[PDB]
Amino acid sequence: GVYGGDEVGALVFDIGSYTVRAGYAGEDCPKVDFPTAIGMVVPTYYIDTNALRVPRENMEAISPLKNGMVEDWDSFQAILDHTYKMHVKSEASLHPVLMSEAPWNTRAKREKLTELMFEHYNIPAFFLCKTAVLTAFANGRSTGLILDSGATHTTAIPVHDGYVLQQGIVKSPLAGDFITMQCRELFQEMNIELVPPYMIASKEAVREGSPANWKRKEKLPQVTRSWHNYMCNCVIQDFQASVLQVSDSTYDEQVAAQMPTVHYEFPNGYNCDFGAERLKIPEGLFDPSNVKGLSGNTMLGVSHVVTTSVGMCDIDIRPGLYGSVIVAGGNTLIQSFTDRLNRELSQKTPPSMRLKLIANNTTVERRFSSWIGGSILASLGTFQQMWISKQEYEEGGKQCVERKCP
Amino acid sequence: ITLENQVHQRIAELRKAGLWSQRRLPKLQEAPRPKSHWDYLLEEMQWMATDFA
Amino acid sequence: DPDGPFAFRRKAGCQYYAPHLDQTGNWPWTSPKDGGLGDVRYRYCLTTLTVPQRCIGFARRRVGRGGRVLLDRAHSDYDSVFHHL
Amino acid sequence: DVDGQTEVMPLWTPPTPPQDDSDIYLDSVMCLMYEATPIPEAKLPPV
Amino acid sequence: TQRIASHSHVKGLGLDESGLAKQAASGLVGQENAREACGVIVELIKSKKMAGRAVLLAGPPGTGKTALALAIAQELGSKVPFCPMVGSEVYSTEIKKTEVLMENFRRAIGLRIKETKEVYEGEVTELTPCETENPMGGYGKTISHVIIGLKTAKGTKQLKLDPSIFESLQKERVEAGDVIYIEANSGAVKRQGRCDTYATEFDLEAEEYVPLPKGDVHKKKEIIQDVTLHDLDVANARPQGGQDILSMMGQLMKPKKTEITDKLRGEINKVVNKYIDQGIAELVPGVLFVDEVHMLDIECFTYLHRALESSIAPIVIFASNRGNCVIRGTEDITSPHGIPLDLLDRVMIIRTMLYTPQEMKQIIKIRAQTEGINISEEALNHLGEIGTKTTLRYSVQLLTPANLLAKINGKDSIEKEHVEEISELFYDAKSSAKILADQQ
Amino acid sequence: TLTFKRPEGMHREVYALLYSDKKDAPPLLPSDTGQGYRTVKAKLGSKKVRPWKWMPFTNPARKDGAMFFHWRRAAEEGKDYPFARFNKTVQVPVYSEQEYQLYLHDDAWTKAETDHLFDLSRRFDLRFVVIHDRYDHQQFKKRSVEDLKERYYHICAKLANVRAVPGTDLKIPVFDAGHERRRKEQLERLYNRTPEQVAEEEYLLQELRKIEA
């Protein structure tokens, strides 16, 4: 007869703006997860936290990606070389590679990526799939609406029979980076001087709201403003993960003020208790019209993004989209995000349609769904005919990826 | 009891406007198709996803 | 025209699927007959083992990777009753 | 159960490839709104 | 298949919900008035309010009066006792006649004893004593509990028992891996053996590696057993204890029947009433059927005068066919049914009638169906004519020989020729008696 | 011998794809050493494993002949790949340019449009929502609806089937596009209702329910 799956020695890479997820196919979690941002000195590149977090003179901090697509190919190549050398620790010519890509990735970047992987790394086989499809596959769904709220974008992607419906995509920029900017504005309003850990030699405990008592390292080299801002944002991201909480209903200041506070201590020893402002900040994801200094009321909340994306699809598949809403991305891990989204969508979905959000609320499942789907797909024995081979590339060139990887 | 004819009348208006959901049209049957490669791939995907979880 | 433009003008030779009027449909899974198609491969049922460990409550049989046959299990509020039933 | 009528527990197996051909494909999304089987000759309109 | 008897076709009285008699139902045909009366009698028995009320079934031979009594048994089911006896059975060599009647009176009264108990069982695993050093005084080492862990099939549980169990515990000689039995009220330990896990290609032990029990470690058992009052009398009259020499002496000398005294009957009634009051027992008064009652002596009838007047007694059904006949035990006293008038005043008489030819034909067809016999219409009519001429029972007896004769001739059904041949191979009582004048 | 239970006396059952609830107990895996190794030391010691190897294989229904690697028993080297049996292709018709002259383009379609439609049909296995999403509306105008592509695919298939067979007739591929259009229009009109209209429908249906019974 037949057997179940089949393991072929493949590798799965899912590269985002925030971190690079990589590992071997067949495993249920990525082997490694390190930041996508890297240092440059001029070029010489420094990758991963242990080399990135050390201060160094004239070292700029960059990203290879822009709008979810590759711009700096030298940085991307450096990241891949680092991943192959230090983390995978195996020769690249032996392992097939399945790569994740953005739903909106252009043809030219797909062709350039295929050319890079086949001609430089000399891999034996290649496949390229979109994030939403793998996110659906990780939850056992072929049809469903993927809501991915990452760092750069909050996007609703409808999926049907393992294919992205590109004309139904709705992008919004309100995501983790926007929340980081709002936290920066909050600290400026509160007159909270933010000192990253690298500047601190030692610290002493102090009271709530009192000035910090800390000593600065004397042996520091002069560092660029980009690296300093990246280090500050690393602190603000911990603040996001710790303190912020979505209001269960529409934000009322008098109700949020009565909630218990949350204590947070900064690396320099400054500490204070945070009240309603920790709930006012993430409310802009859902009701951006009340945000201060935001450019116009034209932009959409998360629920309205979902409904617009579903309404732009064919009427026959909308039950299948509302019956499987797969929430994904790290920014969805803010406390009570999913409950608020479910309530708002229940208030806006038609009563004739049943709404069902997939139970997915863990860090591993929310952040690494695309990688898990890639591992699942590469582990299928039915999939093994779908690889682009090196022979196919040498015969048909880089244009074969459009035919073979829709 | 007097509003029964009114209830019938308003339902007739909705039916004429196409808003009466109980009078939905049925789905035309397209040509049957044997399952293709991609359908079996999706079934195996479901099975493997359950195994992973 | 009682139904307006949306009258069911049948055409010869065609076949039609009726709509769900009484209850909204649902997937083949996470969905008993009280809501959707109950494909039995997704169904959990009470099960007993020949080794003396008792009724294990609701369960399916599923083949995993490597040809290994596993028993899934599902939570019930009456698991304490299914044990010492 | 009852006077007999024995059932066998189902086993979820991999897709077990086909032999010959059949009308195997079914759109699960369309089943969310419409019945799985066609209407019999109780169709009210003649034509 | 099960063997076919004379009354095997009878399954009930065949009465309506209103108690009226169907013309043919439950294997009986006719006797509608008698069957209605038997309906009243089964209601009387089911009421359980009455004691010692008696019934006489009277009529010519062959009128099914024995069948009606067995139909009464079928309607009552197997719960209610039904004790059949023949009048000739009272003449025992071991005990007097009136004792035989009283034994059968008590056999007809039933008792369902529904004792309950709760227990713990399984494989012992611990034998673990607790400890608290001292009993609040000068001390060695004091235990204060004994931890006993049981596991059987469903799970495992630890029991902290009374320390007093320890004496009984090594009296039963238990060790780890054994399987035991302990009762809740008494705490009395009993060893059953050791598990089959130390078995399965070991064998060679008289104790038997008793298998590891099924079910929960803690069990509540509800035992129901049915028993008659005569069983209690017989059991309590004897010294059944094997530890006395006279008990095993009883093995060699014959254990004959004995004339049980009224004191034992009274004490057993007392303890049975106590069980009923306390809720451990349920009384099921039943029926005694005395067929061929005319065989009893005048002494037996005169004792039945007292026996039927008891408040303990069951419902009694008598059957007789005699006319104005001499009572046994008397020299010249004639009385109806061979029974004294004084007892006949104490019974309600159910009359049974002779059958018409159509009823005989219908009964013959029922018996043919019961015996697995296919009979043609003309054969059935000729057999009904024979039954009209001689007797119903004789005509019924000819079916099976005729079927065998047809099977010998290769046929699958009885025709008229086979019954004609069988009626000349075999003779009836009247025809043979007429022949006795010829052959003296 | 072995029992599973679906009782009438309790009457309940549950369904789920991955799992029913986060509180679900984990699955039960097979094992041989659950009762200890010394219980089964002889059974394992009286046997020897069959060797496995990391080995090349061919034909998953590939056209290039590329050889990938996997784990299988060493005695099973030359066997064809089992999963190639799944490679079933949808029977989309094909035609020449001469045959297209009797699939005549209606003065609304073109040869290029029809070829594009059939290419997408072959690629995506007649998933017409996906084909509609991938249709080049810029190069070939906004065809849209999915019914105007379904009906042209099906009329082309009917004409092709009528040509190539010496004699037959065909029922179900007669595609009534107007019925589908009206159906989807009715569904859209119900979808875009405000909540007050839905409440009105519920009130009227409840009135019918109460007055008819």
Curated annotation (Swiss-Prot), chain A:
InterPro entries: Actin, Actin_CS, ATPase_NBD
Result of changing R354W: Found in a patient with developmental delay, speech and learning difficulties, dysmorphic features and abnormal digits; likely pathogenic
Gene Ontology molecular function: chromatin binding; transcription coactivator activity
Keywords of the record: Acetylation, Activator, Chromatin regulator, Disease variant, DNA damage, DNA recombination, DNA repair, Growth regulation, Intellectual disability, Isopeptide bond, Neurogenesis, Nucleus, Phosphoprotein, Transcription, Transcription regulation, Ubl conjugation
Major location (coarse): nucleus
GO cellular component: brahma complex; chromatin; GBAF complex; Ino80 complex; kinetochore; npBAF complex; NuA4 histone acetyltransferase complex; nuclear matrix
Subunit structure: Component of numerous complexes with chromatin remodeling and histone acetyltransferase activity. Component of the NuA4 histone acetyltransferase complex which contains the catalytic subunit KAT5/TIP60 and the subunits EP400, TRRAP/PAF400, BRD8/SMAP, EPC1, DMAP1/DNMAP1, RUVBL1/TIP49, RUVBL2, ING3, actin, ACTL6A/BAF53A, MORF4L1/MRG15, MORF4L2/MRGX, MRGBP, YEATS4/GAS41, VPS72/YL1 and MEAF6. The NuA4 complex interacts with MYC and the adenovirus E1A protein.
Modified residues (Phosphoserine): S63, S210
Cited PROSITE patterns: ACTINS_2
Family from the record: Belongs to the actin family.
Gene that encodes the chain: ACTL6A
Location(s), subcellular: Nucleus
Name of the protein in its database record: Actin-like protein 6A
Domain of life: Eukaryota
SMART domains in UniProt: ACTIN (SM00268)
From Swiss-Prot, chain C:
Compartments (UniProt record): Nucleus; Cytoplasm
Highest taxon of source: Eukaryota
Family membership: Belongs to the enhancer of polycomb family.
Function: Component of the NuA4 histone acetyltransferase (HAT) complex, a multiprotein complex involved in transcriptional activation of select genes principally by acetylation of nucleosomal histones H4 and H2A. The NuA4 complex plays a direct role in repair of DNA double-strand breaks (DSBs) by promoting homologous recombination (HR). The NuA4 complex is also required for spermatid development by promoting acetylation of histones: histone acetylation is required for histone replacement during the transition from round to elongating spermatids.
Assembly, per entry: Component of the NuA4 histone acetyltransferase complex which contains the catalytic subunit KAT5/TIP60 and the subunits EP400, TRRAP/PAF400, BRD8/SMAP, EPC1, DMAP1/DNMAP1, RUVBL1/TIP49, RUVBL2, ING3, actin, ACTL6A/BAF53A, MORF4L1/MRG15, MORF4L2/MRGX, MRGBP, YEATS4/GAS41, VPS72/YL1 and MEAF6. KAT5/TIP60, EPC1, and ING3 together constitute a minimal HAT complex termed Piccolo NuA4. Component of a NuA4-related complex which contains EP400, TRRAP/PAF400, SRCAP, BRD8/SMAP, EPC1, DMAP1/DNMAP1, RUVBL1/TIP49, RUVBL2, actin, ACTL6A/BAF53A, VPS72 and YEATS4/GAS41. Interacts with TRIM27.
Protein name per UniProt: Enhancer of polycomb homolog 1
Full protein segment contained here: 397 to 481 of 836
From Swiss-Prot, chain D:
Annotated compartments: Nucleus
Residues forming coiled coils: none
Tissue specificity comment: Ubiquitously expressed.
Subunit structure: Component of the NuA4 histone acetyltransferase complex which contains the catalytic subunit KAT5/TIP60 and the subunits EP400, TRRAP/PAF400, BRD8/SMAP, EPC1, DMAP1/DNMAP1, RUVBL1/TIP49, RUVBL2, ING3, actin, ACTL6A/BAF53A, MORF4L1/MRG15, MORF4L2/MRGX, MRGBP, YEATS4/GAS41, VPS72/YL1 and MEAF6. May also participate in the formation of NuA4 related complexes which lack the KAT5/TIP60 catalytic subunit, but which include the SWI/SNF related protein SRCAP. The NuA4 complex interacts with MYC and the adenovirus E1A protein. EP400 interacts with TRRAP, RUVBL1 and RUVBL2.
Physiological role: Component of the NuA4 histone acetyltransferase complex which is involved in transcriptional activation of select genes principally by acetylation of nucleosomal histones H4 and H2A. This modification may both alter nucleosome - DNA interactions and promote interaction of the modified histones with other proteins which positively regulate transcription. May be required for transcriptional activation of E2F1 and MYC target genes during cellular proliferation.
Family: Belongs to the SNF2/RAD54 helicase family. SWR1 subfamily.
Protein name: E1A-binding protein p400
Residues of the full protein shown: 2237 to 2283 of 3159
UniProtKB/Swiss-Prot annotation, chain F:
Coiled-coil zones: 182-213
Top-level lineage group: Eukaryota
Cross-link (Glycyl lysine isopeptide (Lys-Gly) (interchain with G-Cter in SUMO2)), chain numbering: K171
SANT domain span: 106-156
Subcellular location: Nucleus; Cytoplasm
Described function: Involved in transcription repression and activation. Its interaction with HDAC2 may provide a mechanism for histone deacetylation in heterochromatin following replication of DNA at late firing origins. Can also repress transcription independently of histone deacetylase activity. May specifically potentiate DAXX-mediated repression of glucocorticoid receptor-dependent transcription. Component of the NuA4 histone acetyltransferase (HAT) complex which is involved in transcriptional activation of select genes principally by acetylation of nucleosomal histones H4 and H2A.
Subunit annotation: Component of the NuA4 histone acetyltransferase complex which contains the catalytic subunit KAT5/TIP60 and the subunits EP400, TRRAP/PAF400, BRD8/SMAP, EPC1, DMAP1/DNMAP1, RUVBL1/TIP49, RUVBL2, ING3, actin, ACTL6A/BAF53A, MORF4L1/MRG15, MORF4L2/MRGX, MRGBP, YEATS4/GAS41, VPS72/YL1 and MEAF6. Component of a NuA4-related complex which contains EP400, TRRAP/PAF400, SRCAP, BRD8/SMAP, EPC1, DMAP1/DNMAP1, RUVBL1/TIP49, RUVBL2, actin, ACTL6A/BAF53A, VPS72 and YEATS4/GAS41. DMAP1 also forms a complex with DNMT1 and HDAC2.
Name assigned to this protein: DNA methyltransferase 1-associated protein 1
Source organism of the structure: Homo sapiens (Human)
Parent-protein residues present: 44 to 256 of 467
